[PDB]
Design a protein around this ligand. Sequence first.
Ligand SMILES: [Zn+2]
Ligand SMILES: [Zn+2]
Ligand SMILES: [Zn+2]
Length: 57
Amino acid sequence: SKFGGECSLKHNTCTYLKGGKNHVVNCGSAANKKCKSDRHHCEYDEHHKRVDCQTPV
Ligand SMILES: [Zn+2]
Ligand SMILES: [Zn+2]
Ligand SMILES: [Zn+2]
């Protein structure tokens, strides 16, 4: 189960909506996972606690 959202450049986080609430998760440090473009689409994989903040739409 993956959840899509928008990343914050300043915070290096992925923001997403789930269950009527806002959530925020750390993008991480990999060069291909950190938030590099403000509000870029990002994905949070709940099963494996992995986040990718460079996933194109
Ligand atoms: Zn922050
Ligand atoms: Zn949450
Ligand atoms: Zn892009």
